[PDB]
């Protein structure tokens, strides 16, 4: 599973990577996540638990935050796992301002998924991989307000 998109977000570089650099905000911005713990240096463990029937489950993951370039460029590497299956996952954002107003953020990913779950198809895999993301970026516009191209 590689992708890559880009969003054009409401805010400048500072507002957009001050949100993404919040392990309180994460929280509340990734699906299903219930707490983000802290257990290393840019390194935290997330309880999932993910209600989207096609992948319906529980599963822990380690998220780094690693290359970081502040306030334009980060590294993730995730190593998710739970009942349905598992994920090894690296992305890389890259911010970009477009003026004034307005940032670009693209990025890149690449996820090995494995266990029952990966045998719902690369398409389909795919849809879910983009409604996260979609999601996350969605919820990420919003809090930022207060202060989607997706290829696969």
């Known amino acids: 599973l590689n992708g890559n998109g880009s969003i054009e977000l409401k805010g400048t570089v500072e507002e957009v990577w001050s949100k993404l650099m919040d392990p309180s905000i994460l929280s509340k911005c990734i699906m299903g996540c ?29 998220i780094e935050v690693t ?3 502040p306030p334009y460029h980060y590294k993730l590497l995730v190593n998710g796992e739970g009942g349905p299956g598992f994920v090894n996952a690296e992305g890389v954002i890259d911010l970009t301002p477009i003026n004034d107003e307005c940032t670009q953020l693209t990025y890149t990913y690449s996820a090995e998924v494995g266990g029952k779950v990966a045998a719902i198809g690369q398409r389909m895999l795919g849809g879910v991989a983009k409604l996260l993301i979609s999601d996350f970026f969605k919820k990420i516009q919003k809090e930022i307000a207060k202060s989607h191209h997706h290829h696969h």
């Open 67 to 69: 290359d970081i370039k």
């Open 34 to 62: 219930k707490s983000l713990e802290l257990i290393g240096e840019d390194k935290y463990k997330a309880d999932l638990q993910i209600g989207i029937a096609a992948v319906k489950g529980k599963y822990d993951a380690i």
